[PDB]
Amino acid sequence: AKHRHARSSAQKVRLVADLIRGKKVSQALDILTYTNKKAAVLVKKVLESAIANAEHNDGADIDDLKVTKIFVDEGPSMKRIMPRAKGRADRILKRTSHITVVVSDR
Amino acid sequence: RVKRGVIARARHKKILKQAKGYYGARSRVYRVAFQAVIKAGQYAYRDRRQRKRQFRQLWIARINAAARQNGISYSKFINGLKKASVEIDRKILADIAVFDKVAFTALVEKAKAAL
RNA sequence: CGUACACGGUGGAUGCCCUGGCAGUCAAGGCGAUGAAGGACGUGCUAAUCUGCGAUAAGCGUCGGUAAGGUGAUAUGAACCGUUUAACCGGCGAUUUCCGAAUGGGGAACCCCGAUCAUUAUCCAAAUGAGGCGAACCGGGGGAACUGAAACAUCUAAGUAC
RNA sequence: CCGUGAGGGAAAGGCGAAAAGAACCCCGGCGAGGGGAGUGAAAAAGAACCUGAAACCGUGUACGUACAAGCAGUGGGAGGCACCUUAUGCGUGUUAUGGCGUGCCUUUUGUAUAAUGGGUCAGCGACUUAUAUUCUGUAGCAAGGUUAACCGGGGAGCCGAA
RNA sequence: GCGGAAGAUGUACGGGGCUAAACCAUGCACCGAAGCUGCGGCAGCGACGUUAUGCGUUGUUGGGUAGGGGAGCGUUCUGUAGCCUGCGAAGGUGUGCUGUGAGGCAUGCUGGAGGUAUCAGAAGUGCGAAUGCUGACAUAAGUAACGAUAAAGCGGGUGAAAAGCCCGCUCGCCGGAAGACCAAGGGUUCCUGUCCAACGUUAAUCGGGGCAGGGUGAGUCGACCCUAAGGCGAGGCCGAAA
RNA sequence: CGACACAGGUGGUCAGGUAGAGAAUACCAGGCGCUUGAGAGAACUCGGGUGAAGGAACUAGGCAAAAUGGUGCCGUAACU
């Protein structure tokens, strides 16, 4: 399944996405349980909901469904007024990223 | 008022395109493209051409590397060539008496004869 | 990690459109002590804005027009109005709080009276005037300097700016 | 929105023929979102929603690549790998190795230059009016020629004619 | 040829190196430029003949900063003649072909509404290059920065989630004070309930955050009243008057 | 108020709450924990303590630091 507007950073995304791009879906669940990176959740509530809807709908066996291709490239950037520095105003060019994951049978 | 049009923004590419043999930048950028190809056009304003009359220092000094193995060389090899027969021009020649252990002698027994 | 491209994104250019501007032309042209212009506060069942009114408050009356639908911009929910012909568009009359030229006096809109000058004068303010506003045009007075003279004291900019 | 105040002062346009604006179901902490599905000619229109580029981001593809020396090419000859929508011993992508190669702009007698300017991008960004005079090229007609205000007429008047 | 000749992080003719690949007197044969010769091709200028910038012949041959002279492609819109398009245009991306070139043209995809050619005009007409203006963006970096009222810790409660929400205990801080009552000033930020997308330089089931309601009931408190320095308006007096 | 939940600035009353000369430290009352975290026993820098013997030899200058420092008795110079 795919995702959209994520408060993620796109950069700190595709960091946790990696390591969980290879084969074995189970190998994608054990890992990602401990990441110490905000970039673990969200990117996990996917590639989990991806393995799901992959079982029912798009018939497939969980025993042989692996992670083939997982990439994260999305936006958009929105004008934000985050108060940095003692006193000043600045617009954040913060971007986002969608966690698209396709876990079919390999 | 007048919309820039198919000029400028139509001038960035139509350049940056032609660079099949580009550089790190000066292919990604236009403020390097132009001043990069400026050397181009010139630099060889009318020189590739340089090749001939350049590496031609050979095909004359190799021709003796062809001879000087079956008699004399250079001096009297291209002087007996314009003696008997239609006299074959020396271009492909002086490059043939190297990549083939034949035909090279097919211009040594021609010379040294009718000498 | 270098470059090109592909898919997606970012970004917003470009192309097209535009209920806006810019410019010219014709017509028409003043408003206020029967207290205006402007502003404030209110007013719609719910309404915060804008608009309209103003406590008979997005309205009331008359005539004519118009027309069967309508209850402003908002196409919500409820409800209601209209053929005892409304909505909507045009003359005349009524009403028209307080301050404001206000003018009794004081005052950052709040509390008590024709204030001030002046004419007539039954000298009683009794009968009247002035005291404000308005895009820039006409008239009557006061009147520079930077600047030009490649310096500057006539002159010049000026009889302009004010 | 800024300044005590006088005053100063932005940016932001477009869903679709119709909204006809995503019913129903799965997922989720969730009217968020995702999947599936529905509408329509098209949503690769789902709401700062037409089209949607460049700088640029991620991924992926082609090809390099941790002994390698630097404008990063030209010509020659060898290596390969990869692709036969332009069949013909004819090309591309990138590239190993080798021979050469000190960005680009002003000032200055001389700048690659330890002379100045620019981080990059897109958009923006600098000889124009009447009149008069003097030449030139082209064109019409020729001691005559042209009118101005105002009337398709005018000749005032101007220049030329010793 | 030698003595005279002493210096600065490792000493040499370009280097290897050489007794001749030294030096001097002669000599022979070669290598070696866009020079000279020669074939083809483009041009320009000038000369001769000419209506000719058409041919024929001839000369130089044809480098250029400042500067002078001359021709041209492309763009916008308004004319005449004349065409293309949803059996799909303009634009955009990639690619093929042509021209010395400016530039023109075709194919595929996308797009999805208009767009041209000729001749004659009209033009706010074609740009890399001002510590230039405005907006956007990359590298720099995921790098520099968080401290006297230096205070939290151990259990427990609630919760999907609790290091900082709440309970208990333990342990501390402040004392003219982080205590109590008020002026000025600010002004609903107060209380309750429901939440959290935004705010709280982490999190939050918490909030002075978001939403909806609720709250500030004096004759003797204060205002209200008065006056001080001083100010204003009216009469009087001065080119004129605010 | 200072553009900020800016260790800055801002008037009055409570100066008898308990131990000292006193409106000086410790502690009731009352208020508060609203001045970012986790793991080895470096160099270097910010504050500070202690340093043998000499002791201003440092320095423009003893700057800095330190010494003396409560109370009672005795006693107290030049100069004015």
Q: Measuring CA to CA, which residue among B74, B73, B75, B93 is closest to residue B85?
A: B93
Establish whether the CB of B25 is closer than 7 Å to any nucleic acid atom in strand C. Answer: yes
Give whole-number Cα distances, B83 to B8, B62, B87, B107, in Å.
65, 21, 7, 12
Give whole-number Cα distances, A99 to A19, A65, B93, in Å.
14, 18, 67
Say if CB A6 and CB A42 are below 8 A apart: yes
Say if CB B110 and CB B79 are below 8 A apart: no
| Structural method | cryo-EM
CA distance B69 to B53: 26
Q: Measuring CA to CA, which residue among A40, A53, A27, A25 is closest to residue A99?
A: A40
Q: A48-54 contacts: CB < 8 A, separation 24 or more?
A: A49/A1, A50/A1, A50/A101, A50/A102, A50/A103, A51/A25, A51/A103, A52/A1, A53/A1, A54/A103, A54/A104
CA distance A105 to B10: 48
Tokens of A85: 């520095």
A21 CA vs C30 C1’ separation (Å): 83
Tokens of A57: 């709908």
Rounded to 5°, angle at Cα B24 from B21 and B26? 75
Establish whether the CB of A22 is closer than 7 Å to any nucleic acid atom in strand C. Answer: no
CA distance A2 to A80: 25
Resolution (in Å) of the shown entry?
15.0
B114 CA vs E68 C1’ separation (Å): 66
DSSP three-state, residue A26: helix
User: CA B30: distance to chain centroid?
Assistant: 31
A100: left (phi over 0), alpha (psi -120 to 50) or beta: beta
Tokens of B9: 């923004």
- What does A29-78 look like in DSSP terms, one character per residue? HHTTSS-SSSBTBSSSSSSSTTTTTSSTTTT--TTSB---EEE--B----
Phi, psi of A29 (to 5 degrees): -95, -45
**Measured CA to C1', what is the nucleotide nearest A86?**
F4
Tokens of B60: 């004359």
CA distance A65 to A103: 6
| Three state DSSP letters for chain B | CCCCCCCCCCCCCCCCCCCCCCCCCCCCCCCCCCCCCCCCCCCCCCCCHHHCCCHHHCCCCCHHHHCCCCCCCHHHCCCCCCCCCCCCCCCCCCCCCCCCCCCCCCCCCCCCCCC
Establish whether the CB of B51 is closer than 7 Å to any nucleic acid atom in strand E. Answer: no
